[PDB]
PDB file of C-alpha atoms and ligand atoms in Angstrom:
ATOM      1  CA  UNK J 945     -29.380 -22.971  -2.374  1.00  0.00           C
ATOM      2  CA  UNK J 946     -26.056 -21.394  -1.406  1.00  0.00           C
ATOM      3  CA  UNK J 947     -22.783 -22.451  -2.994  1.00  0.00           C
ATOM      4  CA  UNK J 948     -21.066 -25.320  -1.201  1.00  0.00           C
ATOM      5  CA  UNK J 949     -17.466 -26.359  -1.789  1.00  0.00           C
ATOM      6  CA  UNK J 950     -14.981 -29.215  -1.761  1.00  0.00           C
ATOM      7  CA  UNK J 951     -11.200 -29.024  -1.478  1.00  0.00           C
ATOM      8  CA  UNK J 952      -8.443 -31.269  -2.797  1.00  0.00           C
ATOM      9  CA  UNK J 953      -6.016 -32.556  -0.172  1.00  0.00           C
ATOM     10  CA  UNK J 954      -2.247 -32.437  -0.666  1.00  0.00           C
ATOM     11  CA  UNK J 955      -1.806 -35.605   1.392  1.00  0.00           C
ATOM     12  CA  UNK J 956      -3.838 -38.100  -0.655  1.00  0.00           C
ATOM     13  CA  UNK J 957      -5.028 -35.956  -3.585  1.00  0.00           C
ATOM     14  CA  UNK J 958      -8.661 -36.804  -2.851  1.00  0.00           C
ATOM     15  CA  UNK J 959     -11.503 -34.303  -2.472  1.00  0.00           C
ATOM     16  CA  UNK J 960     -13.347 -33.408   0.726  1.00  0.00           C
ATOM     17  CA  UNK J 961     -16.431 -31.363   1.548  1.00  0.00           C
ATOM     18  CA  UNK J 962     -15.456 -27.956   2.904  1.00  0.00           C
ATOM     19  CA  UNK J 963     -17.289 -27.015   6.093  1.00  0.00           C
ATOM     20  CA  UNK J 964     -15.861 -23.493   6.324  1.00  0.00           C
ATOM     21  CA  UNK J 965     -13.003 -21.172   5.347  1.00  0.00           C
ATOM     22  CA  UNK J 966     -10.813 -19.748   8.122  1.00  0.00           C
ATOM     23  CA  UNK J 967      -8.208 -17.412   6.627  1.00  0.00           C
ATOM     24  CA  UNK J 968      -5.857 -16.970   3.667  1.00  0.00           C
ATOM     25  CA  UNK J 969      -2.241 -16.338   2.698  1.00  0.00           C
ATOM     26  CA  UNK J 970      -0.073 -15.433  -0.280  1.00  0.00           C
ATOM     27  CA  UNK J 971       3.079 -17.332  -1.186  1.00  0.00           C
ATOM     28  CA  UNK J 972       6.017 -15.140  -2.177  1.00  0.00           C
ATOM     29  CA  UNK J 973       5.583 -17.164  -5.364  1.00  0.00           C
ATOM     30  CA  UNK J 974       2.246 -15.436  -5.924  1.00  0.00           C
ATOM     31  CA  UNK J 975      -0.186 -18.262  -5.220  1.00  0.00           C
ATOM     32  CA  UNK J 976      -3.266 -17.531  -3.135  1.00  0.00           C
ATOM     33  CA  UNK J 977      -4.187 -20.129  -0.526  1.00  0.00           C
ATOM     34  CA  UNK J 978      -7.059 -20.676   1.891  1.00  0.00           C
ATOM     35  CA  UNK J 979      -7.151 -22.535   5.195  1.00  0.00           C
ATOM     36  CA  UNK J 980     -10.192 -24.785   4.972  1.00  0.00           C
ATOM     37  CA  UNK J 981     -12.003 -26.664   7.724  1.00  0.00           C
ATOM     38  CA  UNK J 982     -13.330 -30.020   6.553  1.00  0.00           C
ATOM     39  CA  UNK J 983     -16.669 -31.666   7.344  1.00  0.00           C
ATOM     40  CA  UNK J 984     -17.096 -34.393   9.947  1.00  0.00           C
ATOM     41  CA  UNK J 985      -7.351 -28.261   8.661  1.00  0.00           C
ATOM     42  CA  UNK J 986      -5.304 -27.567   5.538  1.00  0.00           C
ATOM     43  CA  UNK J 987      -3.954 -24.789   3.377  1.00  0.00           C
ATOM     44  CA  UNK J 988      -5.271 -25.444  -0.119  1.00  0.00           C
ATOM     45  CA  UNK J 989      -4.412 -23.632  -3.309  1.00  0.00           C
ATOM     46  CA  UNK J 990      -7.590 -21.699  -4.159  1.00  0.00           C
ATOM     47  CA  UNK J 991      -7.143 -21.836  -7.933  1.00  0.00           C
ATOM     48  CA  UNK J 992      -6.545 -25.577  -8.325  1.00  0.00           C
ATOM     49  CA  UNK J 993      -7.662 -27.220  -5.082  1.00  0.00           C
ATOM     50  CA  UNK J 994     -10.939 -25.541  -4.133  1.00  0.00           C
ATOM     51  CA  UNK J 995     -14.110 -25.862  -6.212  1.00  0.00           C
ATOM     52  CA  UNK J 996     -17.896 -25.951  -6.044  1.00  0.00           C
ATOM     53  CA  UNK J 997     -19.050 -29.270  -4.594  1.00  0.00           C
ATOM     54  CA  UNK J 998     -19.861 -32.224  -6.855  1.00  0.00           C
ATOM     55  CA  UNK J 999     -23.469 -33.352  -7.274  1.00  0.00           C
ATOM     56  CA  UNK J1000     -25.080 -36.813  -6.995  1.00  0.00           C
ATOM     57  CA  UNK J1001     -26.786 -38.163 -10.122  1.00  0.00           C
ATOM     58  CA  UNK J1002     -30.285 -39.674 -10.099  1.00  0.00           C
ATOM     59  CA  UNK J1003     -31.118 -42.858 -12.022  1.00  0.00           C
ATOM     60  CA  UNK J1004     -33.717 -41.042 -14.164  1.00  0.00           C
ATOM     61  CA  UNK J1005     -31.024 -38.578 -15.303  1.00  0.00           C
ATOM     62  CA  UNK J1006     -28.084 -40.951 -15.837  1.00  0.00           C
ATOM     63  CA  UNK J1007     -28.228 -39.933 -19.489  1.00  0.00           C
ATOM     64  CA  UNK J1008     -26.584 -36.593 -18.729  1.00  0.00           C
ATOM     65  CA  UNK J1009     -23.312 -38.386 -17.983  1.00  0.00           C
ATOM     66  CA  UNK J1010     -21.240 -38.816 -21.137  1.00  0.00           C
ATOM     67  CA  UNK J1011     -17.940 -40.278 -22.312  1.00  0.00           C
ATOM     68  CA  UNK J1012     -15.145 -37.811 -21.577  1.00  0.00           C
ATOM     69  CA  UNK J1013     -16.867 -36.146 -18.628  1.00  0.00           C
ATOM     70  CA  UNK J1014     -15.012 -35.381 -15.401  1.00  0.00           C
ATOM     71  CA  UNK J1015     -16.438 -37.099 -12.319  1.00  0.00           C
ATOM     72  CA  UNK J1016     -15.842 -37.378  -8.591  1.00  0.00           C
ATOM     73  CA  UNK J1017     -15.559 -41.123  -8.050  1.00  0.00           C
ATOM     74  CA  UNK J1018     -15.740 -43.216  -4.896  1.00  0.00           C
ATOM     75  CA  UNK J1019     -12.513 -45.181  -5.211  1.00  0.00           C
ATOM     76  CA  UNK J1020     -12.592 -48.033  -2.708  1.00  0.00           C
ATOM     77  CA  UNK J1021      -9.324 -49.910  -2.222  1.00  0.00           C
ATOM     78  CA  UNK J1022      -7.822 -52.343   0.296  1.00  0.00           C
ATOM     79  CA  UNK J1023      -8.996 -47.117   1.969  1.00  0.00           C
ATOM     80  CA  UNK J1024     -11.921 -45.256   0.415  1.00  0.00           C
ATOM     81  CA  UNK J1025     -11.211 -41.945  -1.321  1.00  0.00           C
ATOM     82  CA  UNK J1026     -13.239 -39.581  -3.487  1.00  0.00           C
ATOM     83  CA  UNK J1027     -11.000 -38.662  -6.424  1.00  0.00           C
ATOM     84  CA  UNK J1028     -11.161 -37.424 -10.018  1.00  0.00           C
ATOM     85  CA  UNK J1029     -11.636 -39.576 -13.101  1.00  0.00           C
ATOM     86  CA  UNK J1030     -12.900 -39.353 -16.672  1.00  0.00           C
ATOM     87  CA  UNK J1031     -15.543 -41.520 -18.327  1.00  0.00           C
ATOM     88  CA  UNK J1032     -14.006 -43.639 -21.082  1.00  0.00           C
ATOM     89  CA  UNK J1033     -16.980 -45.851 -21.910  1.00  0.00           C
ATOM     90  CA  UNK J1034     -20.612 -46.379 -20.906  1.00  0.00           C
ATOM     91  CA  UNK J1035     -22.675 -49.572 -20.889  1.00  0.00           C
ATOM     92  CA  UNK J1036     -26.333 -48.539 -20.854  1.00  0.00           C
ATOM     93  CA  UNK J1037     -28.580 -50.872 -18.887  1.00  0.00           C
ATOM     94  CA  UNK J1038     -32.308 -51.504 -18.692  1.00  0.00           C
ATOM     95  CA  UNK J1039     -33.820 -49.771 -15.677  1.00  0.00           C
ATOM     96  CA  UNK J1040     -36.383 -47.270 -14.425  1.00  0.00           C
ATOM     97  CA  UNK J1041     -36.106 -44.315 -12.055  1.00  0.00           C
ATOM     98  CA  UNK J1042     -35.563 -46.473  -8.973  1.00  0.00           C
ATOM     99  CA  UNK J1043     -31.993 -47.560  -9.718  1.00  0.00           C
ATOM    100  CA  UNK J1044     -29.389 -47.201 -12.469  1.00  0.00           C
ATOM    101  CA  UNK J1045     -27.606 -50.389 -13.525  1.00  0.00           C
ATOM    102  CA  UNK J1046     -25.493 -48.710 -16.209  1.00  0.00           C
ATOM    103  CA  UNK J1047     -21.755 -49.317 -15.927  1.00  0.00           C
ATOM    104  CA  UNK J1048     -19.267 -46.460 -16.238  1.00  0.00           C
ATOM    105  CA  UNK J1049     -15.653 -47.225 -17.148  1.00  0.00           C
ATOM    106  CA  UNK J1050     -13.537 -44.554 -15.478  1.00  0.00           C
ATOM    107  CA  UNK J1051      -9.856 -43.668 -15.789  1.00  0.00           C
ATOM    108  CA  UNK J1052      -8.542 -42.140 -12.572  1.00  0.00           C
ATOM    109  CA  UNK J1053      -6.627 -38.899 -13.039  1.00  0.00           C
ATOM    110  CA  UNK J1054      -3.834 -39.548 -10.543  1.00  0.00           C
ATOM    111  CA  UNK J1055      -2.449 -42.853 -11.820  1.00  0.00           C
ATOM    112  CA  UNK J1056      -4.530 -43.590 -14.932  1.00  0.00           C
ATOM    113  CA  UNK J1057      -5.976 -46.719 -13.345  1.00  0.00           C
ATOM    114  CA  UNK J1058      -9.338 -47.916 -14.642  1.00  0.00           C
ATOM    115  CA  UNK J1059     -12.458 -49.155 -12.859  1.00  0.00           C
ATOM    116  CA  UNK J1060     -16.084 -50.037 -13.600  1.00  0.00           C
ATOM    117  CA  UNK J1061     -18.307 -47.866 -11.411  1.00  0.00           C
ATOM    118  CA  UNK J1062     -22.066 -47.715 -10.937  1.00  0.00           C
ATOM    119  CA  UNK J1063     -24.011 -44.460 -10.729  1.00  0.00           C
ATOM    120  CA  UNK J1064     -24.234 -44.818  -6.942  1.00  0.00           C
ATOM    121  CA  UNK J1065     -20.461 -44.297  -6.856  1.00  0.00           C
ATOM    122  CA  UNK J1066     -20.105 -41.157  -9.000  1.00  0.00           C
ATOM    123  CA  UNK J1067     -20.860 -37.438  -8.747  1.00  0.00           C
ATOM    124  CA  UNK J1068     -20.982 -35.034 -11.689  1.00  0.00           C
ATOM    125  CA  UNK J1069     -19.449 -31.584 -11.942  1.00  0.00           C
ATOM    126  CA  UNK J1070     -22.009 -28.753 -11.747  1.00  0.00           C
ATOM    127  CA  UNK J1071     -23.133 -27.074 -14.963  1.00  0.00           C
TER     128      UNK J1071
HETATM  129  O1  LIG O1174     -12.753 -23.362 -10.510  1.00  0.00           O
HETATM  130  C1  LIG O1174     -13.008 -22.367  -9.559  1.00  0.00           C
HETATM  131  C2  LIG O1174     -14.074 -22.795  -8.582  1.00  0.00           C
HETATM  132  O2  LIG O1174     -15.285 -23.165  -9.242  1.00  0.00           O
HETATM  133  C3  LIG O1174     -14.309 -21.626  -7.669  1.00  0.00           C
HETATM  134  O3  LIG O1174     -15.513 -21.794  -6.943  1.00  0.00           O
HETATM  135  C4  LIG O1174     -13.125 -21.563  -6.737  1.00  0.00           C
HETATM  136  O4  LIG O1174     -13.314 -20.430  -5.907  1.00  0.00           O
HETATM  137  C5  LIG O1174     -13.668 -20.879  -4.620  1.00  0.00           C
HETATM  138  C6  LIG O1174     -12.922 -20.068  -3.587  1.00  0.00           C
HETATM  139  C7  LIG O1174     -13.881 -19.151  -2.869  1.00  0.00           C
HETATM  140  C8  LIG O1174     -14.720 -19.945  -1.904  1.00  0.00           C
HETATM  141  C9  LIG O1174     -14.853 -19.182  -0.617  1.00  0.00           C
HETATM  142  C10 LIG O1174     -16.232 -19.400  -0.057  1.00  0.00           C
HETATM  143  C11 LIG O1174     -16.572 -18.322   0.962  1.00  0.00           C
HETATM  144  C12 LIG O1174     -15.334 -17.641   1.483  1.00  0.00           C
HETATM  145  C13 LIG O1174     -14.618 -16.922   0.365  1.00  0.00           C
HETATM  146  C14 LIG O1174     -14.693 -17.717  -0.919  1.00  0.00           C
HETATM  147  O5  LIG O1174     -11.949 -21.381  -7.537  1.00  0.00           O
HETATM  148  C15 LIG O1174     -11.800 -22.243  -8.680  1.00  0.00           C
HETATM  149  C16 LIG O1174     -10.745 -21.610  -9.567  1.00  0.00           C
HETATM  150  O6  LIG O1174     -11.038 -21.892 -10.931  1.00  0.00           O
HETATM  151 ZN1  LIG O1175     -28.593 -45.738 -16.181  1.00  0.00          ZN
END
């Protein structure tokens, strides 16, 4: 499978699946930027704001997610964004391969807010 990407937006600081890359530019400051077309157009800093897409986690492999890990989290508010957070604590549940009822306490990177998310609402970083 070919590499797929997601890009951070400067408007809300959430991440979005990148459909394609159009062009690029260099700031007199030195930074390299790409113009990305999203799925479903921005200039994003390549170094910080573009990265290989996050991956969904299956119930039978929920054990690979540990305290301290970085995760793309579905943050649903009053507004539903996919943004970065770190696992602070994990409550392991009793379940099979069909569904994961573990609870993941996440601290969002932007504002250090905390939320209890289920596996269905998180994606891990590759590797
Ligand atoms: O992190 C890394 C990330 O994993 C890496 O993929 C990202 O590079 C991604 C930019 C290159 C993606 C694009 C795809 C086809 C068109 C030309 C290239 O940069 C980040 C900088 O550290
Ligand atoms: Zn689980």
